[PDB]
Amino acid sequence: MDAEGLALLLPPVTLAALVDSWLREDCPGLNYAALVSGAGPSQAALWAKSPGVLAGQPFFDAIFTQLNCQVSWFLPEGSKLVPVARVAEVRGPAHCLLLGERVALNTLARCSGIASAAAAAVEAARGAGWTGHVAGTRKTTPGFRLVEKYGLLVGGAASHRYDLGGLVMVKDNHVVAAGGVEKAVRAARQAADFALKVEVECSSLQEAVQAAEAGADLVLLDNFKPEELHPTATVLKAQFPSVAVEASGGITLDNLPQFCGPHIDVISMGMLTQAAPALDFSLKLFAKE
Amino acid sequence: MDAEGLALLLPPVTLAALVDSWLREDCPGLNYAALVSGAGPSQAALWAKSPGVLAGQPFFDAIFTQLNCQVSWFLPEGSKLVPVARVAEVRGPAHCLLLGERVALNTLARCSGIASAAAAAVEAARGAGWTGHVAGTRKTTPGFRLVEKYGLLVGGAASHRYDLGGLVMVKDNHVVAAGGVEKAVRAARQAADFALKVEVECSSLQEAVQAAEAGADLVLLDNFKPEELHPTATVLKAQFPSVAVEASGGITLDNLPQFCGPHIDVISMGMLTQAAPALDFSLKLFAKE
Amino acid sequence: MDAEGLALLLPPVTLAALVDSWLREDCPGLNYAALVSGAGPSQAALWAKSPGVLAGQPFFDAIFTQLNCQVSWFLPEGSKLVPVARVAEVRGPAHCLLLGERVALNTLARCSGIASAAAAAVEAARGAGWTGHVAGTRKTTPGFRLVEKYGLLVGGAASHRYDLGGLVMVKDNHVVAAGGVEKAVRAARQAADFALKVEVECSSLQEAVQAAEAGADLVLLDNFKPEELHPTATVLKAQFPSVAVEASGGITLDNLPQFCGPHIDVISMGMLTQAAPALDFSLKLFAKE
Amino acid sequence: MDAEGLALLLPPVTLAALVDSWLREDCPGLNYAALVSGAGPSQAALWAKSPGVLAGQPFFDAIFTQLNCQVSWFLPEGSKLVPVARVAEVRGPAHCLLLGERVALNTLARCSGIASAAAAAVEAARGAGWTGHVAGTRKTTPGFRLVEKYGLLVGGAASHRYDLGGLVMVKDNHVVAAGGVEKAVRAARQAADFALKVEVECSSLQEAVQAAEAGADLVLLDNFKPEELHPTATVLKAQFPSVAVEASGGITLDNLPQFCGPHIDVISMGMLTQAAPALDFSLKLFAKE
Amino acid sequence: MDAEGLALLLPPVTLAALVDSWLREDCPGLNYAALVSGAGPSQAALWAKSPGVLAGQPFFDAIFTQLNCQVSWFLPEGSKLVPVARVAEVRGPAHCLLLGERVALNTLARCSGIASAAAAAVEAARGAGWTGHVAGTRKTTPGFRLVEKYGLLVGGAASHRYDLGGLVMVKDNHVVAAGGVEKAVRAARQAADFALKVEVECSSLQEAVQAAEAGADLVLLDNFKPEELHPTATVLKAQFPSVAVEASGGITLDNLPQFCGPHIDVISMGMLTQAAPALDFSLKLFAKE
Amino acid sequence: MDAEGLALLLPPVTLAALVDSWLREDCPGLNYAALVSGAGPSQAALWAKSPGVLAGQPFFDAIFTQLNCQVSWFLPEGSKLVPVARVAEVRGPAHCLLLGERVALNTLARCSGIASAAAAAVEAARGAGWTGHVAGTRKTTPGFRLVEKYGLLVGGAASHRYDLGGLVMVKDNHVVAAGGVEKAVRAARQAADFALKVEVECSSLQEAVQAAEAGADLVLLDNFKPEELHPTATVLKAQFPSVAVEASGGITLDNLPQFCGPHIDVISMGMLTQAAPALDFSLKLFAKE
Ligand SMILES: O=C(O)c1ccc[n+]([C@@H]2O[C@H](COP(=O)([O-])O)[C@@H](O)[C@H]2O)c1
Ligand SMILES: O=C(O)c1ccc[n+]([C@@H]2O[C@H](COP(=O)([O-])O)[C@@H](O)[C@H]2O)c1
Ligand SMILES: O=C(O)c1ccc[n+]([C@@H]2O[C@H](COP(=O)([O-])O)[C@@H](O)[C@H]2O)c1
Ligand SMILES: O=C(O)c1ccc[n+]([C@@H]2O[C@H](COP(=O)([O-])O)[C@@H](O)[C@H]2O)c1
Ligand SMILES: O=C(O)c1ccc[n+]([C@@H]2O[C@H](COP(=O)([O-])O)[C@@H](O)[C@H]2O)c1
Ligand SMILES: O=C(O)c1ccc[n+]([C@@H]2O[C@H](COP(=O)([O-])O)[C@@H](O)[C@H]2O)c1
């Protein structure tokens, strides 16, 4: 509902340590450019130069907070960005603003790109009349998942499982390793019967039926062509009405409406995190009025 | 030098701490799916399903080494990927293979994705007759710089400075803070006269002349149109022949040939790391004869 | 239904870090006692002097692997301990055996003490004909959760959710802060509709019906005397066949039969981790012959 | 002699680091329940529902300090707890209160459970006229020693050595490795030099005399029957009056008066940290008026 | 030219982490002495008892900020110390002052010792009519480089490169491994043509000419006799006027003037961080009036 | 006694973490020089070019072991170094040898420099007939205390207390804060009666008598002239035969005989760690076949 409340999801203690490692990565030793700018109190304007959705204020704020700077936002989390928009002002000693600048922009750009992709996907789906959830994956940049799942939520998608613990997800490789879908789904059920859910990844109707018989909570139809996707889900919903159907594999902004259908509850797209270009933001010091 | 030599640039201690933190990110508690697959010895085939350049073997290796798995590659680092290619084979306990799969794949996908954009840019420059350096920027994913700068090098681009400690770069914001170009360049030269180089980002020809007169090693012409860019660089090289000229701002694979010019030495592209989609890789367990 | 394979659940990277920090805590500087013992090859015996269930071999093994010692076990993980039993042999340099001894016994004692409480509780419950799950809680020693939740599993109990990122549980305090059960539960269901489960802690029959109406996967009947409990539950399963029922509040080894009932699916006991005395083990060096 | 002033023993850099790891353990990713409570200002009351001694206010405070919450205590550290007592009030944003609640109660229950067991021991020892030190052991939970040693002090017991540094302690296993008591405490005496004391665990009157002859400061008489313990301690003090005698092994709250004696200076019980059940506390949100 | 400005080079995140690691080294567990002093407000005066240069205020300040203490300086950074001077006053709880006393004095004493040695070398060089850069090396105490490089700057020396990332330095061993100087600097030149500098360490005029002819930005003449050093530099400056010339190897304050010469740009000295004795500072609590 | 045994004191968990932080300090990103040397197998000789005592082999081994290099020592830990001497060989890949070279030489140079100062102070006191202990202090480089305390031991000196959790030490500032010598030491005697030692730092003979009378184990006569130090030590020994006497403050190599006396038990010298120059070592790659 409200993109403004999503920030309560982020534990305060994780932000500070996350942010501290990013700052150290960009300046591990002596910050020679501090001598160029000096330490006088300054003001920068944050400028939106790309269209999209604003996501990332919590991480932007945390970065500058460790550098004793303050941020005033002129747009809420989740806003549509119409270029060229003035979206915040940052205040602090000049060398601190310029030290935090690059990391803060990198984070805002990337989080917002993901939310902009997610909002477009949510839009395309509703424009085909589909009421299910658009979702992300675990195809995230390592070390950056907290930012990328947050960005999905701001854009209106579900984050899907955060990590491997999680919901027990039986994949192709698990079926092979366990010697059969029925053995794998039985082993996944025991591993947390109460209460984690079990999702099972299925390359065909007959695997999906076997997964549902063995007790899957969710059935993921993997890499179906749309023309076989919907018949398969119809049979499933008629035979196992309380099992949820997820479609996934090669779904993009463009072909997404072909994968929306009344018997698909969830559509997950790797593109939301692997192919969402970053938005264009700049931070510019200006003289005080 | 040669793409296989590049792996030596990676300090093995940093590799291990990066890899461990990525794994703890994807599985911070219990790995319930390890019960589904068990620990029996298995083999998995790495498949390349996107065209491009293969980059990131050192990280893929270090991920799996930490889980006591081994990798045999069938293509060298920097190889062209012609899909559908069988790129490697991974060996080890089934649960260790499946626990590292996603992290390893996510790393290789983004690293290869960046190397693929760099290769594409170096190609576009060479086909325009340009012998300069195509270069990356500091617009990298927070936490992930080591992989992305490594990706740039495998693709044939220069990484540019690794962080704020490796070359004193006077930007528009330093100029405003310092009171002006020549004040800012003087403080930059002090801050490490011997010996770090000083690069100055300039938005006008006069700003470029002031910076070169003030002793900049490198003058970066920022967001010039090509029609304004090349006459500026010609003037600069005429008056200051030992000052290198860089061009940057809004340069993409498509417009890259318009910015090549006999008086440009470096061309830096934020897009090589911010808008380079990841390649598609899978890892499929295959049965024991 | 096999305690030897539970070790696969422990991610190897989390084990080594945890063990390192335990060894650092017990010896932060110089280890003066190493000079008293020297470094000659030697062997110790592990002695179980308490009845119960043996749990914690992977942690015990990991501690001594960091100290270049080897361990041979004479009883599989989960075995019944009949004192005074010779449980294992540890081999390595004398000072390394004696450096690991206290941390290894401390971990094994507590992991086995918890598994022993868990096994006794599970034994009580099937002796009353019960088929549901005996479970643990988040009343764990801070920083020791991985050992204590693993111990629950070794003794046959369910771990319940590992931390706040598993199933969304709304408690009395959430209901007070949301201003009502059905508000709380409706927010909970949004926060991850697909797919994490939602569990609601209820003090009174009315609350549980509200919770179930609103979409709870699980209702926890908290602090019921067994007199009200089994009516309450058989009502709920009548009205809501599809919703799981959990009993919690003051359930101990002595009174556990009185909470076992046929419409109760899960019984969780904070005593399994808060009042589970450690078993008594010792490690004794013995001479070669 | 003043439990309020013990909090100065805890260095504040360590407290924040330990507290951050505990919070990170209980919520490693997104905190979904935060969307259920919101962030509106709230107050919770701390209820003691158990008899004992109150211990652990600095850790409790430090947890809620990291979460931007305040604590008001109505009982000083060390007070007797008569249930059901209102111990404190915690103020702050509701999600912040609910995120720290479990870890704060977990820490206070264990700390207090220990200080309550210590105070019982000091009560029983005082009831037998014994003026020596009741002390703890190194049988603490790995990772938690700071809380548990502090809890021993709050309840009137001596902590004993914190770690493997501190006093050099010759044990059964050292005597085996060094080939005799004389050799082991001569090597110990050398390592200890002038700053550390030497204590020797002795299971017979012969060992105790050899240890005292070879310069031990303390002799620990290990696993003696009470009838054998007191003559041994007496003859030792006659022959070596400068040597402190400690008794230890199987000493419990019920049998502790039997081990008290005018020639025992220290009595140590693993019981106080390995078998002290945690006190019952709760934290309940309430409406301001 | 301003010692008070150098503090801006220190990124505040790194300061906190480094400072906390030093406090934890000196007090890993309980601070027993805190009971001896109590927590009442106190004041202590910092006393300089050595002649030299004051350096290290940012580290001294940061230690005491972590401990909720405040510092007031009566001398700016880089001041000349004429003993016995009263250079600062520290205010805070009694136990926090005494907790930080030793770490802060150890830090200030080494930093000021390095700055004193650097200023002595600069004064000797200036008394020989030399105005090039006196420079440090990477012969720093491991883990203490930020303090030691900072102290070189306060004293008037150049820090030289901070680590293996600042400038590619071809040493004797690189030459041997590369199979010759031409191959080495060619490879070095490739590692970062634009733009890091390449310095080559040379033991003969012929090696230096080759290093220069092959592209070196700086030539370091290592362990020359002054009699052969100055003719060598004169040749290099005449045939390669843009290449900087460094002298290094065995250069001490007492022999430094013989190494000063019109064609030496940089003189670097291991002894500035390896043979620089610390200064004597004390911190004495004082009372009301 | 035997310096070769002292390596047993070093817990290997701590060595790896220390060493990792030092390597990361010296190369936080890409190691450009690795491309100059390549990765082929190589060898380097370790030369001692300063007189003194060899100390720090375990830290040197650990550095290279982290880089997959092996070290062969030709002299034992603690040897007298008669320059020039071939101390060791190091083998491994060329770029790993050159990556560890500086950190490994820095650690060995400071460790050996400290041991050399220790051995000379021990010999000075032996030549004066004195049988007490020469001791170090806590005037140690922050972060480096393990190497420096270790270096003292290899030189034949006592380390004195490692940190604040060793013996409780009442200093001038503690006396001022407690309001009296004699209330200070009683607070200190409580803070760990059994069993840590109490040392009191005294400026006058009356102060020593009060510390002795209130129960100090050790009395440090701080900054006495030798003329008054020995009369004072004699009174104390006569009145308090079991109290040990330390002498400290301004004691150097050349006046150490003046502080030796029959009633001084310990002499401690800040200069052993604050004014002990590092020894000169070099590591030289040499070609094979
Ligand atoms: O591991 C997960 O949590 C997870 C959640 C949702 C989807 N996936 C997988 O992500 C893949 C998405 O494919 P794509 O083409 O959109 O990159 C598909 O193979 C799914 O099985 C994986
Ligand atoms: O800070 C650096 O290391 C750096 C190196 C090269 C380029 N840049 C900046 O990157 C910008 C180019 O970004 P883009 O997205 O327009 O390709 C340009 O404005 C430069 O100032 C920055
Ligand atoms: O937060 C959890 O994960 C959780 C899981 C299971 C149970 N609990 C709570 O644990 C409590 C059990 O109390 P007790 O007497 O068994 O210590 C009961 O009040 C439940 O609400 C809490
Ligand atoms: O290592 C220590 O610091 C230490 C301090 C005091 C006692 N102990 C040992 O702890 C044992 C007491 O265990 P318990 O649970 O039987 O009372 C006994 O064998 C002592 O030698 C060990
Ligand atoms: O690696 C560096 O950054 C570096 C910078 C400047 C000098 N050095 C080396 O330092 C050595 C001089 O140190 P010293 O103790 O002989 O005065 C000489 O051999 C140089 O090669 C090394
Ligand atoms: O704090 C310690 O553990 C410690 C141990 C031994 C000596 N000291 C102090 O070291 C000081 C002697 O330093 P110095 O530089 O004059 O040789 C003297 O003032 C003692 O109080 C301090």
Residue numbers in the entry:
A (entry chain A), B (entry chain B), C (entry chain F), D (entry chain E), E (entry chain C), F (entry chain D): 1 to 289
The authors write:
QPRTs have been shown to exist as dimers or hexamers2223242526272829.
complex with QA or NAMN as a reactant or product. the product and form a hexamer in the HsQPRT-open structure. product complex to have a more relaxed hexamer. may provide the driving force to release NAMN.
